[PDB]
Amino acid sequence: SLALPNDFEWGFATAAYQIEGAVKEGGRGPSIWDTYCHLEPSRTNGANGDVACDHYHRYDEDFDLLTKYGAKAYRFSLSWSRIIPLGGRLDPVNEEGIEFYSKLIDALLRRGITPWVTLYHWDLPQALHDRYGGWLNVEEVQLDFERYARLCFERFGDRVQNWITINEPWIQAIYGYATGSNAPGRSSINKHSTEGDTATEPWLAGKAQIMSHARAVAVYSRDFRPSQKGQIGISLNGDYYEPWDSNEPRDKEAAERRMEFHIGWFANPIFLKKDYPESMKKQLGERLPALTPADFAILNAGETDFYGMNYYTSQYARHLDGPVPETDYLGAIHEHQENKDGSPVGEESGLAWLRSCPDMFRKHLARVYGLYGKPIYITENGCPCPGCEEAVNDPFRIRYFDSHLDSISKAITQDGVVVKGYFAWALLDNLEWSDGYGPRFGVTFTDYTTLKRTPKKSALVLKDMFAARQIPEELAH
Amino acid sequence: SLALPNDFEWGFATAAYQIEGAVKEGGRGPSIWDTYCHLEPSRTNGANGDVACDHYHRYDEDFDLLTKYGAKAYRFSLSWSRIIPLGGRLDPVNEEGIEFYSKLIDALLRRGITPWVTLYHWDLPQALHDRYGGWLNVEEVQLDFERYARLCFERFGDRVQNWITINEPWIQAIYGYATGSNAPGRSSINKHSTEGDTATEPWLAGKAQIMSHARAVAVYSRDFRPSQKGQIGISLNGDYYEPWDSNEPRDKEAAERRMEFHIGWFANPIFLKKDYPESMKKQLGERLPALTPADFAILNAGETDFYGMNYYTSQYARHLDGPVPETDYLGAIHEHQENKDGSPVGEESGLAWLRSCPDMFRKHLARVYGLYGKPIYITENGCPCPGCEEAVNDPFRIRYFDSHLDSISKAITQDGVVVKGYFAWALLDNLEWSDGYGPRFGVTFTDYTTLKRTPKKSALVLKDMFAARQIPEELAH
Amino acid sequence: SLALPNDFEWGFATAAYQIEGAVKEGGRGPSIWDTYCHLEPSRTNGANGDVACDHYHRYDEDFDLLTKYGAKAYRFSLSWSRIIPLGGRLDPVNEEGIEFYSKLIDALLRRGITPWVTLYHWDLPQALHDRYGGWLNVEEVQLDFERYARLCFERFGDRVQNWITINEPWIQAIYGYATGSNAPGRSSINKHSTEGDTATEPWLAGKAQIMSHARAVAVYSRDFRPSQKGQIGISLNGDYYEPWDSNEPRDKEAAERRMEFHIGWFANPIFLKKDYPESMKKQLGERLPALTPADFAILNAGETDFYGMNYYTSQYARHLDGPVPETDYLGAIHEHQENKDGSPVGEESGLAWLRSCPDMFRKHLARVYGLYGKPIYITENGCPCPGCEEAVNDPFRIRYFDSHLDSISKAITQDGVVVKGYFAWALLDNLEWSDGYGPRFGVTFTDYTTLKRTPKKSALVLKDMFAARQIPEELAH
């Protein structure tokens, strides 16, 4: 029922802050999310990272869900502020934190599960923000990250051969420094509050992450990958955009300009060794922090091994007439979830911003492969069903998976896209960041008062979908 | 209360197909049972090995029942078609299959349990059947098996000291190729179906299994045992038969003839290095494939270290007036569960064919030891209760376990038979092969809808029956 | 909220006989408690060590409670009778017993938990009692113990870096050989039984453990610690006594005399290399077996690393006018739980003897450090609630744990006491020895008919107490 390779590594994915809790235990220090969640009035729906799912204490209860679900790999992330218990370079290390992750990795290997490890998933140590402004201080933050990354390669790299440096850098840059909807919540276009400057600060945070990645890849490529033999990558998200008015030249152009303002921003330095896309250099200043010949030096001393790709939904884009403000980051675009002819991007989950678009996903894989184009692992793909533990039946979610795998099969076998693997978001119901515990994305239902976890129908079926796509000269004998 | 040695290994048994499920995942391919179960009209009572107990995904839950029950050891089977994912010799190995078993072995050793691995338990690769006749082709299959065995000695044999090559070769032969009731379902004397020839095929498959065993013990003796230090053995079954008319010449003779067509067939080559019991070379042709001088060369260039014995019940055998057909495999006999003086063999379980005969179990052990006579491990023994999860109270099973441990004790200290261990069938409730899920043999009730396991009374009491049979200079305080 | 160090190793404790069960299994020979529990009429309120918690079979279920509770360390006890299946020195060594604890140690490690091992916890092999009186025989018993300690060092010493020789030597001596309330139940003053002499026996049984400890620590210091790098200690209990009538010189003296008959007895040889506290040598005879020069040879040829302290309650001692009998072991004292001015020591748990007295706990800590004064680990501390599974709400126990941790903070940062760790009695509800299963001391309620464990609130909360007292430069962000 539509052929995925054979190798094809699939599993489940979970960010650190969204499930671990144990915020002050283990000698961990605060993240910028530990401050954002406790603001008065709350910017996080009155939601907290304390407790969460209590994974820190119940990790082996969850890992046995990973063998029950038949998962092959498990993507998770490290809490920077739990390892270097906040700062970097010269700051002391938290041995208890290193030891906590070292026994998770051991826990996993014992079970036959492939650890995929993400170094940074938005949970920047607070101290570094106060000390020099966090991702706003490009020179400093990338040096502090480089040591952190390297520590992790040292302490976990003999096991763990599958690395991801930074998760969705565009959200950390834009939601964190332009709109302020994510930690640290800085902006000129909100309420608000104390500080921000959405005209210059997102483009700093981007370059800082871009260089942070480059540094760690250079470290890994030169000093580790030979002896340790592993992959390293970055994972970018980005909706596919096709034109609003299909019959209009200016919007076939406006839909691609958006996808260069989202993916091209990062994928040009990190994969093509070119600097910023020109559509993007021409709108923003000056305001766009130049890549110096020293930057391409760190970039050209290391390979990024794969394109990690977070996908959930697509959209229609269409132009502007007017001359855009400084405070525009999308690249002169009005985004819609409907086109000219009233028809939607298609079938919804709700939320509302996420809707199931299985053949714009396929289109997405074909564009993102060739420009750029390294192998694509799908590092996040998931969904919330529309609508208690009536949640055990999630037929919407099952059909979301199936149709989105069908266009991975299609992309591979009809468009010659190399896709190597797929992590489903998420293993547990999380804290959906500043959305709170509202949204339930996981294939396991977490009962936030009992901290009890019971499987949804999707968890027990997903192994059977993968099993029925790999074969294949046995669909006989 | 009735001394079993001190050493005396005991624990539970399970068979690969009967519990694992995950029939298509982990790159495993079809065994011949996968085809037999899916016949239309079903020859397996509408039953499936798809799922079963889902032990592929719940194995570690099951193993904590092993320590909950005080089990010292655990016999289980590999799925040939999961390891060499269909065929042998020149065929690719399934690494996901080999590592799945790697982590079982590992999980057991961690719990202090002693893995006892059966290599073959009726789940011959399907491709092998299609490619040359499966067990019907003696020259090929034994070579395909030798490589298979050798892969296992390499991959699991530094752990794993205790090996059983083939489980109940008599059933595979006769029920698989003479009566057609077990997979692959070929016979002349059934409906039916397409193929079979009960005149000639069970004797081929017999020798093919005998030689497959010899081959593997050859490999193990010459190439692994010296370094790995361990046992290889075969586990044969066979009811004990005594005359139907005690008072009378031709039954003292008829019963033992039936016990040669059943144990001696296999035991003569594998233990005595003699060929086929002559009472058998004399009834079958010609139809009985001769052990070539090249076969006694494989047989006596390696030693089988123990007699693995399955036992469930006993019977009264007795003769033919008339000259027996070509389609007679029991050895010119018709068998009863009754002597003529009316009395039953003794106390039934139902089923209906299996009744608890502890007296004749003892006579059996003494017969089977000295002719042939190596140490006996009882590698399967168990029953189903007469009669929901009312099943938790299983007094019948307990008294069954008790009275047969009694006769083991009796056989050791009075008859001087060496009996080194006892595996109870079964740990879980299974697919009882072509009988389906109906007959519950386990000491754990499995709930086939939830896949829930809860122990039965017998599970928690058996550990105590052994502890009280092994002391012994402290029964003093 | 009141600073405990940073290191500060905290966890839960349990004794061997109290939770293990499986009294005949694993070839384990009887302890002295095995006989005392089965006496007619019962001296243990009709209670039994068989089954108990059945932790022998359910150890992994409880260790999972360990990480759920966020424990750092776990103090447990070996069963001498189970390792050397009864006796010492020349007796065989039960392998099935050594491998059992090797897999607890293995399992604890695998979870990140630090094993703390108590060699002896009141469960002396019965064979030794009958062979030469056990503890009454100083010469033989200290020799059989040195072999035992040694073998443990050998078989578990490369894992396991923290050893406790004997748990509460005072109780084994006085309740065992003076009043008879504990096994083996000898005394001149009781119900009854056939033998005893409280005049002389408790002081023999004291010396015999002192030298057993001395022996073990001799071995460990000289042969193991340099390579194995670890700690060895003894854990001593004893109430804190302050004067009954404040205003009175006669028994600011008698309180301290009672603490020397209770702690100084053991602490003087074991930590100061003095012999018996003067006041004690001068009341007892004759009857107090002198420390030969050869004993102070063992003693100062190896050092005890730390002071294990068992604390539960406190008390008002004070005087005797009268000349003391030959059967007074307390030190010429009448002990009350209230002073002259009516007021109680403070707040009851019940039981009735155990009251929550945090104020004097601090004074205790201050006294025991400086004479003697090595770092102190509270190797036991806990209580039962005043009062079914309404026990899950244990707000008295939480208030007990909190106040007594406050004293530890206070003692450290103001009285200059080194306290390095705290173990809470107990992880589970136990067999509280001769009291039976009545008193529920655990932070996990154990249903003795289901052997089901469910956490009380204290368990889930304790980990947050410690998190909150360790920090400490981020108490800010």
Q: How is this structure best described in words?
A:
The first copy, chain A, is an alpha/beta fold and 477 residues long. Chain A has a single domain, classed as TIM Barrel, CATH 3.20.20.80. The first copy, chain A, is 37% helix and 15% strand. Chain A has 15 helices and 13 strands. In chain A, the strands form 3 sheets. The first copy, chain A, has an 8-stranded parallel β-barrel, surrounded by 5 helices. In chain A, α14 links the parallel β10 and β11. Chains in contact: A-B, A-C, B-C. Chains B and C meet through α3 and α16 of B and α3, α5 and α6 of C. Chains A, B, C: It is an enzyme of class 3 (hydrolase). Chains A, B, C: It catalyses: Hydrolysis of terminal, non-reducing beta-D-glucosyl residues with release of beta-D-glucose. Chains A, B, C: One of its GO terms (molecular function) is cellobiose glucosidase activity. Chains A, B, C: Its EC number is 3.2.1.21.
Morphology of chain A: globular
CATH superfamily of chain A: Glycosidases
Kindly state the percentage of residues in helix of chain A. Answer: 25-40%
The class by helix and strand makeup of chain A works out as alpha/beta
Radius of gyration of chain A: 21 Å
Oligomeric status: homotrimer
Number of domains of chain A: 1
Q: What portion of residues of chain A belong to β-strands?
A: 5-15%
Contiguous helical run count of chain A:
15
Query: Spatial order of the strands in the main sheet of chain A?
Result: 1-2-3-4-5-7-10-11
Straight-line distance between termini of chain A: 17 Å
- Would you identify the CATH architecture of chain A? Alpha-Beta Barrel
- Give a quick account of the main beta sheet of chain A: strands, pairing sense, barrel closure: 8 strands, parallel, barrel
Largest interface, and how many residues on either side? B-C, 17 and 23 residues
